[PDB]
Each structure stands twice: as structure tokens, then as C-alpha cells.
């Protein structure tokens, strides 16, 4: 069973965030999340969008989220990251997230999820490869 | 962070607390103890221990469900706890304590592949920050601690250590029933 | 009819009884019963009313499947709505009373959140067409027993149009939300 | 689980509708069933395609059915459209489906399902803006 | 032969035996056998005959979880076979002896709607590649699988390099982990 | 759920393979993966995948594998095949995988099964116009 929450409006709250700051992403970038299945900050975007109208207009209960975990995240996204959790190999906390911010224009690509191993993240060096790639992609947007 | 001279990198750190009242969130504070926070209202409390709390076998489970005292958020967590044991062979292992819907859950632990390999192999992924401290093997894995138990507790600032998330708990649902052995002939 | 240029509003609706034969077809009827039929031969009859058809408490499960005179789709089905059962803790609400092959299985339905909050819960995935908004944590209708009993079929629904998707959405979650009872599966 | 199942070459017939007459979609427009998974259009497709293959080719009984629901149709689809169901928005009972033929050739949009609310269809006007969109998109198309 | 002129096929086979650590493998040998690897060493024997050797009605399968001398990945693969079986009501036809730690399972086979149809169902679909040859089934006789051979036996075994029919293969087995607790009929109230 | 294992950097050798050796395909060819989820070769490299990744970086426990099923293949195309061989439909067995080739510059279309449909494999014959489908989208490069 695959994921199939179309989320609603995407741009973030300053609640969801750590540090308060009126971040919001372009709804080209964001329409990515609809057919990509790999990506960790779609999956946590749809459950934030899932809180957000739970709590908001539906009057606590875990038989709801129980049910509905599928549609909001791919499980077997959780299952790859713990497989690459025990292996030595660097998981994805879910937690710190990068993109690739175009000043100028504004628009923005995707963000993934910052890798960790050791209990500390990889400063820019280990997956710089995969910033380029990204920023390669970017370009091929235009 | 200047990539191409035209992109700069904009980190995003997600706060997890909002999402406490629609389900779960874990933290550890110590390298141990283990919490899973259902809301403001009592949680889930998981330690690991020498001291024992329970000294007795017996587990009256069925009879916890005929009262029907005990919060029903913390029956499912725990009953998803104890369902995702990769491998559970040994009935002794478990012995619980419900009284007034109190939850109160001990798992004996004491040279591979036994119930202490497949339980704490469940408990280090109630959370993956906070767990590992207490990578060359999994599959084979013990600690020094001799007992889990699981407690309910209310809720006070237990997440000083590791970032509260839901990541684990969510994780578990899907293999909440993935492997259990056969103990009956008729299931 | 242009709606964009030319671009017209057309629309197509699906026959649901040619799909009669391969899995269950749920119907509504009144507001309170609600039906299934496995084929065009037989099926469950899903009511909820005051009035108890059986009085025991007692349900041989496990004798039941020994004599074996049961239709196996039939018990099949319920033992997806019994299984589907968010958190089924008060395990004497239920009464079965097999006896001959008979399935005349019930439910009893009696702040909130109790067992019939789940029953109730189940019923209205199961038969998803009229099973009657913001009331999720305690649905509590007011009709005080549920009802599950095999059916020969007929034209037992015209109310709510025939469809299995009720079905196929409790087919899946047969095992989630369910409270462990044995200390050792 | 996906939506493994093909579509054997697709054409919808007179008994399985009701004042339809061989209404049939073209080869580009079921395309997109072996890649959209939000779709209940193409889910109806795959039900009525192996519904089809089970009189004609297999020789009454669930075990088929319960056999080869993941990989014919995805479940939460209908959780989600049962979760819209509880949430007063509208949903989806896959009753009615609603596209647009061309006037001057047989290439049509991918219909998408008429919405319900409390009971009763919802207005053309409320998703108008959602017809927009699909006519934006085909036009794109072009 | 070549497609456009400039594109010729080229063909990739795959040697599965290479499987056998990390995820089990079954095969087929002897039209009754159907051998299953679980990893370097062991497996089990997945054997159809006519002579019973479990003549008793009991399985003492807690006392079997109780002593522990079994091995565990063993009765994980009877487990996953056990709860995979479609519409599994009689009980007093299997007969399983646990003690010792062998793994011994007697599905006892003796209207085609009963035990020995889903049984058997999962039988070919556990070892998938020649199984064929073992169901004198037909072709979309999904409803009725039937046998010559009376029982299903199950059996502890050493290895011996049994693949003589068809080759090593996972995908029996890894597809039907899923079909585990699919289709179980309820057994209690509160289960 | 969906697949969600990352294939590392994915060419075989004889250690993996039956007959050729060194059969290495490009990055362009395998990136076909991420996008599409009803084809065997997929799993199968996943599966070669971690059987690499577990051989090495850990240290023959079923469990790892009964945990991680769904996150490493699709069970789903598997008992789509288990289908087609109750119809007798052509299936395939997941042994034998065809594919287009050409020594210009190398690329290569990602493979397909070699469907199986008498109990030896199908000649080409039968199934020419999948390959020529495969064929004339392997012009579209532009
Ligand atoms: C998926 O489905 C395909 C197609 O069914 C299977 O592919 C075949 O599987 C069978 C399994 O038996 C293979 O059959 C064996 O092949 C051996 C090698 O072939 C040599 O000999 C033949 C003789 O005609 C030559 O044509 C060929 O070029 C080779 O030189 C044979 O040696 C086997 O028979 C003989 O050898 C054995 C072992 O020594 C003896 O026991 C026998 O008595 C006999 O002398 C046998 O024919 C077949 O080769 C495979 N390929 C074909 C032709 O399709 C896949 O295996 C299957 N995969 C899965 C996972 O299900
Ligand atoms: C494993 O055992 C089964 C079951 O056999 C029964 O149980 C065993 C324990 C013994 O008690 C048997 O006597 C029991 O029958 C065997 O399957 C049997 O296969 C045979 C054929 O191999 C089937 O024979 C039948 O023949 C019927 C017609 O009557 C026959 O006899 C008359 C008189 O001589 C003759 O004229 C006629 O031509 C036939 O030979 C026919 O109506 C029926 O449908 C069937 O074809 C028998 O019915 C099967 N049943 C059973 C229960 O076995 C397996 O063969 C055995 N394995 C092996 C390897 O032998
Ligand atoms: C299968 O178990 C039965 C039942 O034995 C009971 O359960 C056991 C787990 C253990 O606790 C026994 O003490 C219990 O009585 C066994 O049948 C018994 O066999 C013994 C020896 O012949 C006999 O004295 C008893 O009366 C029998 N009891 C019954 C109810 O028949 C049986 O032997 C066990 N099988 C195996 C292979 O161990
Ligand atoms: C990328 O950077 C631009 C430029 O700073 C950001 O634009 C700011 O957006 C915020 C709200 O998110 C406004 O308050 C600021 O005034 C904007 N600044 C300018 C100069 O226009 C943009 O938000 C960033 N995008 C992301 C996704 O982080
Ligand atoms: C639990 O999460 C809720 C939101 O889901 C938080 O409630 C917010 O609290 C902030 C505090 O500054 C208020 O500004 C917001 O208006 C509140 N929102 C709602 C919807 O009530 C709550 O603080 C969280 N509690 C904890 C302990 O983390
Ligand atoms: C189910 O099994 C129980 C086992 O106690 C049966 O209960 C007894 O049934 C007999 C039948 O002759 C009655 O005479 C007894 O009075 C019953 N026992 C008690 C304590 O009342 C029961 O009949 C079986 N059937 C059902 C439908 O429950
Ligand atoms: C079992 O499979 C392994 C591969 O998983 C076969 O290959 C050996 O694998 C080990 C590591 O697991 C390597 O060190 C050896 O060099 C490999 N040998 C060969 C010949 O490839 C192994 O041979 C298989 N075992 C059996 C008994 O067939
Ligand atoms: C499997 O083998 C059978 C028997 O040889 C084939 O059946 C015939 O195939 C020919 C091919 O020219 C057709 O013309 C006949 O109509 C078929 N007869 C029947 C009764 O089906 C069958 O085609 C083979 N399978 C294939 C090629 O996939
Ligand atoms: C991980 O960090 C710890 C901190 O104590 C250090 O001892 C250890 O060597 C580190 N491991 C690796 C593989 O870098
Ligand atoms: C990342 O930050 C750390 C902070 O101590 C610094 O020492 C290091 O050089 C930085 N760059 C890396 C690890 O590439
Ligand atoms: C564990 O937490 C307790 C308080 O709950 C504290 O006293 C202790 O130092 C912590 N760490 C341990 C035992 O390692
Ligand atoms: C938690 O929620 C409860 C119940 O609504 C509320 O009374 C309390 O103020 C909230 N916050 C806490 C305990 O910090
Ligand atoms: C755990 O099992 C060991 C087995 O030797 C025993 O000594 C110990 O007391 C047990 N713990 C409890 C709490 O029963
Ligand atoms: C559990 O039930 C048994 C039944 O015999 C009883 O003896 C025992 O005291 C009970 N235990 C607790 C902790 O209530
Ligand atoms: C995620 O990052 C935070 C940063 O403070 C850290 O505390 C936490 O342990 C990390 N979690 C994991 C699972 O790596
Ligand atoms: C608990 O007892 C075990 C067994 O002797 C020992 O290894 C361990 O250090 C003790 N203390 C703790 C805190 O686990
Ligand atoms: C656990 O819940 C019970 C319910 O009666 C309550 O009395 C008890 O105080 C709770 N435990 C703690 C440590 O708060
Ligand atoms: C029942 O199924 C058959 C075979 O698919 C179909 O032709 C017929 O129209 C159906 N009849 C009804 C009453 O649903
Ligand atoms: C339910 O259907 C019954 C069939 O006997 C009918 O009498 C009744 O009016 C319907 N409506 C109810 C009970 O509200
Ligand atoms: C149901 O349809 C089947 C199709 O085979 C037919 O044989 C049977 O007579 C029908 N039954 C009724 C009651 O119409
Ligand atoms: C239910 O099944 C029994 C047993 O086959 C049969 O006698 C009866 O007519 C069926 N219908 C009802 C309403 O009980
Ligand atoms: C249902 O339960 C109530 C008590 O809640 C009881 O009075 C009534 O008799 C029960 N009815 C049954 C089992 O039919
Ligand atoms: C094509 O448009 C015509 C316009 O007359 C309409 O009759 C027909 O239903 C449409 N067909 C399809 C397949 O959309
Ligand atoms: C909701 O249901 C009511 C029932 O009275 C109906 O009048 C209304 O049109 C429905 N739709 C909306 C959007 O309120
Ligand atoms: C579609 O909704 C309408 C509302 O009137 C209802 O009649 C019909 O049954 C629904 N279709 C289904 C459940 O197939
Ligand atoms: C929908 O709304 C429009 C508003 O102009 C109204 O004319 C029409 O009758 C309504 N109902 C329909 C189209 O069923
Ligand atoms: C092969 O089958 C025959 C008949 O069942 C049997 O006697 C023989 O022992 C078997 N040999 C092996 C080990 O395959
Ligand atoms: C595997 O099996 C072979 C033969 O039994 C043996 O020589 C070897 O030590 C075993 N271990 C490995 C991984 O090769
Ligand atoms: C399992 O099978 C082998 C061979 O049948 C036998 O040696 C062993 O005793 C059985 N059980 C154990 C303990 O391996
Ligand atoms: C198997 O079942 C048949 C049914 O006739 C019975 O006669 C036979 O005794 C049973 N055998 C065993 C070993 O249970
Ligand atoms: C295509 O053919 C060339 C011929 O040199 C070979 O190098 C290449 O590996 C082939 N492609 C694949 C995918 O094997
Ligand atoms: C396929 O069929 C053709 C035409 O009959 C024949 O010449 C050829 O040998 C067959 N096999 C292959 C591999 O092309």
C-alpha cells in the first residue's frame, strides 16, 4: 500500500520550526512530493498537514494515527533508515534538513535530510557530492 | 556555505513538539530511560534496571482487560511493544502487574539469540538518538542492564538529552505483527 | 456544454452488480440495517436494533470450526469485522451461538469511548454508503445491539447503491489497534 | 505494495455501466495508470480487469480477492478517502467520474471522481477551479 | 535479429545460489521433496508421503517454545508457513513433535474446499519454482489443489546439496511473508 | 508500503552472476529504479544489494530479512506472477531478463524478464512488441 495523502494548503508555520522564521517553499518544489516515494521531508510534511487538520478541526486517541500512519509516511522508509542506522553507514535523524536557497529569483529545490553518524552531522563534506547533484538538477530546472 | 556563487544552504531543524497531540513523541534523557510521551496526559516510561519492581511470574492480562481500568493510549503502546519482539519464545521472560489500571511491565533479561537479544533489539527503537549509547552487530546484541520495565508516568521535561520525534514509534506499527512465532495450533 | 474552449463536462458512472461475482457487495437499505452479499446467493445481514436475538454469553468459537457446517466466506467476513475491532477489551460483549452452521453472531452496545465506539467504528467502514461529523473519539448510536447473520439473498437493497470498497478497506488493518491478551503469541 | 496489476488492452462495456454505450478511453490516456498512485479511476480499471480474467480465464470464494488486493489496488486511498469522509470535507464514494473529451478527436483527459458532500454530489462550481486545472494541464499537454 | 539496426539484445542470467546467507532459498528434488535452504548449512524437508510418523493427535508446541532446544530461524520459516496457510480451521489434522529441538510438521491431507487445498496452496506458493509437478491441480484451479500423497511432512534436515530439479530460489518464500495473519480465521473472543 | 533501498554504485560480476562476467550497466540506465515500482529487476538488485551490504559491514539470522521485506522488494509483483502461472498467463520466474544494447556508446534500456510461458522461455516472436515498444523509447533522447 502506498502513501496517497495530498497534503493542503505548501508554506511552513513558525511553530513547526525551531527557531521561529516564516520559511515557505515554492508549490513547484513542493508538487515533487506528490510522485517521489524516497523523500524524507515529504513524509514528515504530510504528517505535520495531518496534525495541523487534526488538531485544528477534528475534536487523545492513537487509534487514529495507527490507522492512518500509510498514507502520511512510507513505514518502509523508516525501515531503510534503520537498516542504515545499524550499519555503520550515516541514517537520516529526521531532524536538520538543507537546501539550496536561489537568492536572487527565489525559488528553491527540495530539501533532504541532513545525514548523521556518531551522533553528529556531516559538516558539508561527505555528501557535498550530493549537494552538487542537487544543484545540477537546479540548473537543469531552468 | 557559497555552491556555484548564485545558492547558499538554509538549514531546517523541525521542531516535533507540535505534532504531540495527534500521536506519540520519544526522548531519552539518560542513556537508559527511555519515555514516550502520548501528551500532557501520563506516558510511557522505559527503563532498564537491576532493581527488579514486580517479583512474581504471573501476569494477569486478561483479567487487567475484564476491569478495563488501565488508559487505553498506553495499552496500545505497550501492546505494540510487546507484539514487535522480533522473536519471543519464552513465556517466563514477561511478568507484569496491573492493579487500579496501573501499567507496570517487566522483562527478565540474563549466550545469543535469546529474549533479551529480540526485546532490547525492540527497545533500542523506541528512539534511534539516545539508544545506540547504551554498530558492528545487531542481530546478536546484549547489554550489562538485567531488567526492563515500563512504567507510566506523567509528563515533566524527560527529553533534556535527546530531541523528542515520533520516528521510532511510527516506525514499529507496521511490524507490530510481522514476526510471531506460533504458540497455539489454532491461531 | 463547453466548460474551457472545447472542452466539454462528460461523466460516466460504473455498474457496481457486475462485480457481483468475485468479492462481498455492501448495500444500506434503511437507515438502521445494513447488508452484504457474497455473490448472488447468499449473504450477512448487518442490523442494529433494541431487541436481542440470542441471550447466552457464550461463544464455542473452536467447535464451531470442528463440525464444520459453516459456508467459509461467511465466518470469513466476520472474522474480518472481529478482528478489524480497534481495541476490543470487554470480551464478553460479544455472543456468537454457532449452532448447524448458523452465524447469528452480536454485539452488545452497552465519559464514552467504550467498546461500542469501535463496534460502531468498524460498522460504518464496513457498510460505507449510509452508515449515517466531527465525533470520532465517541460515535455511541443510539440503537443498543448489533446483529451479524447469514442471509439467503435477494433483492434486499435499493436504497444505497452496491459496493465492495468498504470491504477492501477493512480487509486491510485486520491486525492493527489490537490489544495483546496472551503473555506469549 | 504497488499497483502491479496491468490493464489488458482498455475498453469499458455496456453491462458494466448503465446508459453507457462502449464508452472506451484511449491508449495515452490510461497511460498514466501504471504511474499515478492517487488515482481511483485507474483502481476501478485494474478491479474490473481482473474481474474479467476471473470469469474468463480462472475457473463463490474470498481467498482471490484477499489474495490480490495490494497488489491491485493500493488500501489507503480509501482510508484516505474514508479519512476525508470523517472530516465533513468532500470525498470519493467511486460512483460517478467526471472528464473531458475532446470535440474534434477521441483524446480525452484521465477522469477524476465526481465528490459527494454529506450525501449528496457536490456542486460543479465548488471543484470548477479543480476543471481548470485539469484543462491547464491538457492544454500543457498539447 | 537486431531492432532498428543499431540496437542489438543482449540477455542477463542470475545464479541465485549465491542467496543462501542471506535469505532462504528452497528448491526441487524428486517430485515429492521441494528441499528449502535456510542459510549455509541446515533446511528443511519438505516431504509428501503416504507413511505417517507423527501417530499422535498432540504437538506440545508450548513446552516446545518452553525448553528452547529448537533452532529459532527453523521455526521462524514454520511460523511464516503456519500463519500463511488461507482459511486454517481444523486443528486435529496437523500433527507437529517438537521434542529435542527437531522440527517435525504433519499436515494430514485426507468438497475440495477443506484443510489440505490451503495447505497445499501454500506449499507451491512457498516453493514456487517446481511445484507444478507435485499438484495435480490443472491450470486456474485455484479452488481445488489436490494430491496424490496423503500428508505433508516437515522435517529438520542437513543440506547435502539437494537441488536436483529446479534451481535456488528466494521469491517463493520472500512473497509469502506477506500472506502471514492475511487470512486467519478468529479462534477467541479476545484474542 | 513502497521500495525504499538506494542502489550503491550497480554493476555485477561473476560472484552475483551465472555465466557473463563484469556486466556493469550506467548510472543513467539503473536511475530508472527510483521512478518505477512493477518490474523485477529492481528487486533484484536490491536484493544483491544488501546480500553485498550483509556478507560485509555485519557479522545466518532470518530475522534481518523478516523485518525488512516490504523496504527491499515488492512482495506485490511476486504474487502478480504467482497469478499469471494460476492463469497461465506468460510469467516470470525472476531468472532470465532481456534488454537492448548497442557498442556505439554502451547505453542500455533497464532490462525486463524474459517471461516464461510453455515451461522453457518464450521465443522472441511472441513478445516482439514489448521490445519494440522498449525499442522505439529508447529513440526518445532528445
Ligand atoms: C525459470 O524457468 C526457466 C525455464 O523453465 C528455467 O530455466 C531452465 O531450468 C531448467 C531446470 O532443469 C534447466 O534444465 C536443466 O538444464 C541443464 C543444462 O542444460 C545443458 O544441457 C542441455 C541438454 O539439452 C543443453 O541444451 C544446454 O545447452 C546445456 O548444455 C541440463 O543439463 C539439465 O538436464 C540434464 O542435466 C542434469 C544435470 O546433469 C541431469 O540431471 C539430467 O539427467 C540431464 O542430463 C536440465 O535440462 C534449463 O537448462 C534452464 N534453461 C532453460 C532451457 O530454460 C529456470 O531455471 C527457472 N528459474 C526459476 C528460478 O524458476
Ligand atoms: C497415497 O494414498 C492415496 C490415498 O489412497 C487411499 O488411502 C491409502 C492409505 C490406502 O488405503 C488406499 O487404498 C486408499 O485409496 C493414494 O491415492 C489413490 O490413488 C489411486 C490410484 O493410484 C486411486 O485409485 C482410484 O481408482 C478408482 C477406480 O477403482 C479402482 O479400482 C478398481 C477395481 O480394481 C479398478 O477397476 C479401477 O480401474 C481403479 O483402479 C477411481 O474411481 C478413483 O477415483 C481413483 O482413480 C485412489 O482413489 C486414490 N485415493 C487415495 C485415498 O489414495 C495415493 O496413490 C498414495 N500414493 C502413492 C504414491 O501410491
Ligand atoms: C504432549 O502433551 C501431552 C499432555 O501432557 C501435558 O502437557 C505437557 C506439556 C506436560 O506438562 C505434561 O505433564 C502434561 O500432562 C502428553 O500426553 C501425556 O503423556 C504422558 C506420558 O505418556 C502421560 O503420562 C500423560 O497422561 C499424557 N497426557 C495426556 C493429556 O494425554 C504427550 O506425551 C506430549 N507429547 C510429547 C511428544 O511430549
Ligand atoms: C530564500 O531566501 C530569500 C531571500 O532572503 C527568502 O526570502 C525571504 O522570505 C521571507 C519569508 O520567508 C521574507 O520575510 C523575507 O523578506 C524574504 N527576503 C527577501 C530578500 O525577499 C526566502 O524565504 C528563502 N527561501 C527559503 C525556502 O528559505
Ligand atoms: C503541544 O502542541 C500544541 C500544538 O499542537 C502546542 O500548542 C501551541 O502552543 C503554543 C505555545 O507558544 C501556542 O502559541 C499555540 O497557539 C498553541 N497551539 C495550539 C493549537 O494550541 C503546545 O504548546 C504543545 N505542548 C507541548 C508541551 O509541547
Ligand atoms: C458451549 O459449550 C458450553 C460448555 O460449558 C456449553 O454449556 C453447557 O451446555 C449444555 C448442553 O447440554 C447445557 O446443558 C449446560 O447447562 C451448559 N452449561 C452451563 C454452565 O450452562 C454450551 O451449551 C455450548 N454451546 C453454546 C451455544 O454455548
Ligand atoms: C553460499 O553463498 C555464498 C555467497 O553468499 C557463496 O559464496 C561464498 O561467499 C563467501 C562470503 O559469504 C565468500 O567468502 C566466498 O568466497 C564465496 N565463495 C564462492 C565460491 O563464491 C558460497 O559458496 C555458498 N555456499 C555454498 C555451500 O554453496
Ligand atoms: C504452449 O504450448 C501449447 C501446445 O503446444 C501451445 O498451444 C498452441 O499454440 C499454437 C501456436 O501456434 C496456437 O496456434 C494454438 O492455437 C495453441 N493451442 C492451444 C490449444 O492453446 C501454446 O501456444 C504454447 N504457449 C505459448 C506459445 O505461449
Ligand atoms: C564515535 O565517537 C566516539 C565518541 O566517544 C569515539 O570514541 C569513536 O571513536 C567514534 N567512532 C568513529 C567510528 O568515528
Ligand atoms: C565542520 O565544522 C567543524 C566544527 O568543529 C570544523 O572543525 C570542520 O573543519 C568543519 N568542516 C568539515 C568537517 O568538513
Ligand atoms: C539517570 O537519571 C537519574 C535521574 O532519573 C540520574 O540520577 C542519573 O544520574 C542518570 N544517569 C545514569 C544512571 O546513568
Ligand atoms: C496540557 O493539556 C492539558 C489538558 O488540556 C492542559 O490543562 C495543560 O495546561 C496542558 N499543558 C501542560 C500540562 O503543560
Ligand atoms: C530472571 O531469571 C533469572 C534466571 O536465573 C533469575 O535468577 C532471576 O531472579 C529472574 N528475575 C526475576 C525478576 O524473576
Ligand atoms: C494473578 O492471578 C492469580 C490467579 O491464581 C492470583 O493467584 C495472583 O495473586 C494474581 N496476581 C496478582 C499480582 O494480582
Ligand atoms: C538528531 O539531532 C539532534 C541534535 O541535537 C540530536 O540531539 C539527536 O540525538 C539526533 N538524533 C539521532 C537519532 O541521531
Ligand atoms: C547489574 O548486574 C550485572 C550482572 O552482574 C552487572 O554486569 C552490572 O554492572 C550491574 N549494574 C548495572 C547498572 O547494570
Ligand atoms: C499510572 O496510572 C495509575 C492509574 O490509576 C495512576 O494511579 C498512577 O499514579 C500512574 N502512575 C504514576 C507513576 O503516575
Ligand atoms: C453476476 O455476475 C455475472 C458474471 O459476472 C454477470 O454477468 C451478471 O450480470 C451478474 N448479475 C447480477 C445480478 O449482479
Ligand atoms: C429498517 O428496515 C425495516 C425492515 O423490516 C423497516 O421496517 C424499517 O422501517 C427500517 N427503518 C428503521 C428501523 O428505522
Ligand atoms: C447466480 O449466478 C450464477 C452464475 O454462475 C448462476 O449459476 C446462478 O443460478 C445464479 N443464482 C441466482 C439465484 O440467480
Ligand atoms: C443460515 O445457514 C443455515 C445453515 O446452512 C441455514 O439453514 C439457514 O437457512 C441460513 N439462513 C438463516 C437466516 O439462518
Ligand atoms: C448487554 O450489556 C448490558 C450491561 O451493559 C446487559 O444488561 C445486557 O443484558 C447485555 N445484553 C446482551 C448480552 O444481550
Ligand atoms: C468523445 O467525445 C464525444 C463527443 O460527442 C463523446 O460522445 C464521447 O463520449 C467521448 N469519448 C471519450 C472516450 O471520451
Ligand atoms: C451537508 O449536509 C447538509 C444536511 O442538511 C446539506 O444541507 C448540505 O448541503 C451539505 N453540504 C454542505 C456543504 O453543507
Ligand atoms: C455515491 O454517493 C451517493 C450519494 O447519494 C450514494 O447514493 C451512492 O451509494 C454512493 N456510491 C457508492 C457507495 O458506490
Ligand atoms: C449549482 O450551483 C449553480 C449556481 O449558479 C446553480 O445554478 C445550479 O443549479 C446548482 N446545481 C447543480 C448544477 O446541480
Ligand atoms: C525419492 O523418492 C522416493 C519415493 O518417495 C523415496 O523412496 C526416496 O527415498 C527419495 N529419495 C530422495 C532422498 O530424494
Ligand atoms: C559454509 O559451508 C561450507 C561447507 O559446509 C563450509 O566449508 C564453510 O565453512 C561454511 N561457511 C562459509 C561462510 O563458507
Ligand atoms: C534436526 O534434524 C537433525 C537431522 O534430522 C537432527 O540431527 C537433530 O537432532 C534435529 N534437531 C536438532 C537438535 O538439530
Ligand atoms: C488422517 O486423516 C484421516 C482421515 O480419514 C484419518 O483416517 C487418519 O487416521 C489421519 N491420520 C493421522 C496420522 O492423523
Ligand atoms: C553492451 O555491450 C558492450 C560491448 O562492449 C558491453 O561493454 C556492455 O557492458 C554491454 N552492456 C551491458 C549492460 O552489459
Ligand atoms: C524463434 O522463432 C523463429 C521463427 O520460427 C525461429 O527461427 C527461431 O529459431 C526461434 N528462436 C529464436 C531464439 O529466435
Given at each position: 500500500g502506498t502513501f496517497t495523502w495530498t497534503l493542503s494548503d505548501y508554506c511552513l508555520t513558525?511553530?513547526?520550526?525551531?527557531?521561529?522564521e516564516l520559511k515557505c517553499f515554492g508549490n513547484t518544489a513542493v508538487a515533487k512530493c506528490n510522485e517521489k516515494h524516497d523523500e524524507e521531508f515529504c513524509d514528515m510534511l504530510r504528517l505535520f498537514d495531518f496534525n495541523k487538520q487534526a488538531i485544528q478541526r477534528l475534536k487523545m486517541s492513537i487509534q487514529l494515527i495507527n490507522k492512518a500512519v500509510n498514507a502520511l509516511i512510507n513505514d518502509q522508509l523508516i525501515m531503510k533508515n534503520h537498516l542504515r542506522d545499524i550499519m555503520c553507514i550515516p541514517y537520516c535523524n529526521y531532524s536538520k534538513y538543507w537546501y539550496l536557497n536561489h537568492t536572487t529569483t527565489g525559488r528553491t529545490s527540495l530539501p533532504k535530510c541532513w545525514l548523521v553518524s556518531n551522533g553528529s552531522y556531516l559538516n558539508?563534506?561527505?555528501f557535498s557530492d550530493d549537494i552538487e547533484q542537487q544543484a545540477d538538477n537546479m540548473i537543469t530546472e531552468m | 556555505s557559497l555552491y556555484k556563487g548564485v545558492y547558499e544552504l538554509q538549514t531546517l531543524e523541525l521542531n516535533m513538539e507540535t505534532l504531540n497531540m495527534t500521536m506519540p513523541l520519544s526522548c531519552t534523557k539518560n542513556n537508559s530511560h527511555h519515555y514516550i510521551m502520548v501528551g500532557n496526559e501520563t506516558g510511557l516510561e522505559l527503563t532498564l534496571t537491576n532493581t527488579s519492581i514486580i517479583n512474581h511470574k504471573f501476569c494477569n492480562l486478561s483479567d487487567a482487560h475484564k476491569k478495563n481500568l488501565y488508559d487505553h493510549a498506553l495499552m496500545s503502546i505497550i501492546s505494540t511493544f510487546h507484539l514487535s519482539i522480533?522473536?519471543?519464545?519464552?513465556?517466563?521472560?514477561m511478568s507484569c502487574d496491573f492493579n487500579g489500571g496501573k501499567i507496570s511491565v517487566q522483562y527478565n533479561l540474563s549466550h545469543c539469540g535469546t529474549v533479551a537479544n529480540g526485546v532490547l533489539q525492540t527497545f533500542m527503537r523506541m528512539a534511534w538518538g539516545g539508544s545506540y549509547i547504551a554498530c558492528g552487530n545487531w542481530d546478536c546484541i546484549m547489554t550489562s542492564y538485567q531488567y526492563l520495565i515500563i512504567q507510566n508516568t506523567t509528563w515533566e521535561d524527560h527529553c533534556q538529552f535527546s530531541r523528542p520525534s515520533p520516528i521510532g514509534y511510527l516506525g514499529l506499527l507496521s511490524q507490530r505483527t510481522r514476526d510471531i512465532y506460533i504458540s497455539r495450533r489454532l491461531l
Open positions: 513558525r511553530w513547526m520550526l525551531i527557531e521561529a558539508e563534506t561527505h | 522480533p522473536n519471543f519464545n519464552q513465556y517466563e521472560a
